Amino acid sequence: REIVCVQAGQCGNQIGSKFWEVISDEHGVDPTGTYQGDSDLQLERINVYFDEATGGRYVPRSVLIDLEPGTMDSVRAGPYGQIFRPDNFIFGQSGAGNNWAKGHYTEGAELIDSVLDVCCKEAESCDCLQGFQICHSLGGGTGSGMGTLLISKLREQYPDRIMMTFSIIPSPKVSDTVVEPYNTTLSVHQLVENSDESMCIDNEALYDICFRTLKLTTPTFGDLNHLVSAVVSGVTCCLRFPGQLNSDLRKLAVNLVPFPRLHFFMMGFAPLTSRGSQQYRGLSVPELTQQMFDAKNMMQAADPRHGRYLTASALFRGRMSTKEVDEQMLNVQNKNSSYFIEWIPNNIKSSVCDIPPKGLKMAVTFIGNNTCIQEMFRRVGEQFTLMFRRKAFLHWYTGEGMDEMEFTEAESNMNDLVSEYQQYQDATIE
């Protein structure tokens, strides 16, 4: 059961570099690619993320895409960069210019065939293929446009697999790019049709995690990408280690999605605590559950207290009792009963895996389906409507070839997504 990863754009390539460092460390893979682990439990599922090259070596099942090779030279120069297969780096000769239309229509159609050829070469090698996993930002240029183009093509070629995405979205307080709302709106329009499950992360939430929980004085993008790589490697842990109650991406989707368009999720990872304080408090299931529902530890700007949970899933890693897990989830459901949708008798799924991440006694990753995600989309739609009434920068997109009708379709689809979440928030049994 093998997963194929796709990394697109600057953010995607950097997060991918940190993710593959974490995965190579957990399975004891040397930066030269040699297996150096010390237990068969590490080796028995190495196939899930690695292919075997001759005489010991392993190569990572990943596709790297970018329009200017600067990032590719940066990842190749990194400490684990050598592990990547040279033929898996695909690049053009001119940038996306932060424009969705260039990335989707002009350089996208020029490079996309070579990416589909590489993805098919990688897909057809698996004995049984599990879903694809993609990381990219929606605010950029090549990440949003070519990522959504490739997602559409892979959904045409492999409609029976799973499509899962990790996505970075523009912060409400400081913009990194002026035209972020257009790229975000067009990308959300593409994702709601093509994706099976989509997870969203705000950089502002990672800064609040770092400042309040870790008390870091001068955080850097390496810390944010480590938190993301930790949770990403955690979601798949039950696929690749033994446990008392196994779980799988399809089983998570089946328990989390009540209706097919409601596939946007919140993310969290529990054991976060500053290096000075950590000597003063031991890990235990009540502490993990209390931190798990605390909004300071959640990777979105929306707060759960303004919405209600339709469904949630918790995957536990470590040697622990099932009694504490079931009774904690019952106690949290009973004490905060107003925040759970009443027409579902139990909203939380639990799963238990025996092998924790290195250096932690126990760990849990949390995935949540909450209507407060509607608040993020409304803010982006507001900024989009403010620029569009005045045709603020539209000539770039129209000169590339976009029909204005595409902008009105994306606006209508995003408004309908916000409305459907709001309607399910205020639904009743009657």
Partner: protein, 442 residues
């Protein structure tokens, strides 16, 4: 003499590990299948034959199949400690799970795996001379256990016909829960199980957690404890086939005595001397004390209170040092009690069994060593409360057709929900009518 065990999915394989650990340690078979006999004079007793067959070199191999759609747990059994005990063909594993969908197990994926399983069961049934039933262990909360268990029971029921099928089933606990879609899978499983099973044993994890907290002193139990208790129960019920005794009980006598009407086959289970090693030496454990223990609701492995219903039949299995006169005195005292009530059409409510072999003690176990034990299986109208709560949860969720698109996409007609829900409604009304006093005489 022989019985074949079928293990399905996650709960069934994990409970199988505890069961086969117990049967090996009780007979004396080593993890590699050999019996370390102390003398050559005399001959080795035939009691193993119910569960093991010997090769011409004297190795033992067990009469069981392990069925799963995901490989991980069976690969863990293949790589664990009992690797050499099981025959590799018996451990069957597919590539991918039924993802909590009954439809995916029954229509799309189990249809590919079912013919290999039937070929293995046929290969076992050809190597028998007195097969007298199938024992099945599975959970109805998950997708592959429900879907493949139903499809496989249907095929065995057509191929083998009259042979009996007794099930030990893990149902969704009344307030502890693990997955959102549990009501749909449990309803659809129960619809197939109603027509094609002779006796169904009901289990709830919340009851075994309560029993392990109150009687034993374990604050943080895990599935290995529950599975060891279930293995002890199965060993007690099957002991009547394997060892000498005053009053033996064949599985057909079990079916004849406990089931009054062909649909009324769901039974409650309890076990008496659940006690810790430190408490066991301060107290005597006479027959009357454990007989009084089996009727208290604190002893049950299903979360239901029998004071809200009526008993129809009880089957009491005693193993160890017991004398029939003490069993008679105990049953007469129970009959005197005012809080125990039987339906007026069942005057002779009890079946007894007495076996001489006392229960075995497992090195890492948590139960004390005791000279005698009693196990009870009983038919009671109180079980109607479990179905009423599953059906109520189904009605709340089905009112918005929650998650239904998964089931329709994997191959099932929407009509099957309504048919199963109407059949379970009829079973609830059957339990209402059978328990109604015959005050009207015409």
């Amino acid at each position: 003499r022989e019985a074949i065990c079928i293990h399905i999915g996650q709960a069934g394989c994990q409970v199988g590990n505890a069961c086969w650990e117990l049967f090996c340690l009780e007979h004396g078979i080593q993890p590699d299948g050999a019996m370390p006999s102390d003398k050559t004079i005399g001959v080795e007793d035939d009691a193993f034959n119910t569960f093991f067959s010997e090769t011409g070199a004297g190795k033992h191999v067990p009469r069981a199949v392990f069925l799963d759609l995901e490989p991980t747990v069976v690969d863990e059994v293949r790589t664990g400690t009992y690797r050499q005990l099981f025959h590799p063909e018996q451990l069957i594993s597919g590539k991918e799970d039924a993802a909590n969908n009954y439809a995916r197990g029954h229509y799309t994926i189990g249809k590919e795996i079912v013919d290999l399983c039937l070929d293995r069961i046929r290969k076992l049934a050809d190597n028998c001379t007195g097969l007298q039933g199938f024992l099945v262990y599975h959970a109805v909360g998950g997708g592959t256990g429900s879907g493949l268990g139903a499809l496989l029971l249907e095929r065995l029921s057509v191929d083998y016909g009259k042979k009996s099928k007794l099930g030990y089933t893990v149902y969704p606990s009344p307030q502890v829960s693990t997955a959102v879609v549990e009501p749909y899978n449990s309803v659809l499983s129960t619809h197939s199980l109603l027509e094609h099973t002779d006796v169904a044993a009901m289990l709830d994890n919340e009851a075994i957690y309560d029993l392990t907290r109150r009687n034993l002193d374990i604050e943080r139990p895990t599935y290995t404890n529950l599975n060891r208790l279930i293995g002890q129960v199965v060993s007690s019920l099957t002991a009547s086939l394997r060892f000498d005794g005053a009053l033996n009980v064949d599985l057909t006598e079990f079916q004849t005595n406990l089931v009054p009407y062909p649909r009324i086959h769901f039974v409650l289970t309890s076990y008496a001397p659940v006690i810790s090693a430190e408490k066991a030496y301060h107290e005597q454990l006479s027959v009357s004390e454990i007989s009084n223990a089996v009727f208290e609701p604190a002893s049950m492995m299903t979360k239901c209170d029998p004071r809200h219903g009526k008993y129809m039949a009880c089957c009491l299995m005693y193993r160890g040092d017991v004398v029939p006169k003490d069993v008679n005195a105990a049953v007469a005292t129970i009959k005197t009690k005012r809080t125990i009530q039987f339906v007026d059409w069942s005057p002779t409510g009890f079946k007894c069994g007495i076996n001489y072999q006392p229960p075995t003690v497992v090195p890492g176990g948590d139960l004390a060593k005791v000279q005698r034990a009693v196990c009870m299986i009983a038919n009671s109208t109180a079980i109607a409360e479990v179905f009423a709560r599953i059906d109520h949860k189904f009605d709340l969720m089905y009112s918005k057709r929650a998650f239904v698109h998964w089931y329709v996409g994997e191959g099932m007609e929407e009509g099957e929900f309504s048919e199963a829900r109407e059949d379970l409604a009829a079973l609830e009304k059957d339990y209402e009518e059978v328990g109604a006093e015959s005050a009207d005489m015409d």
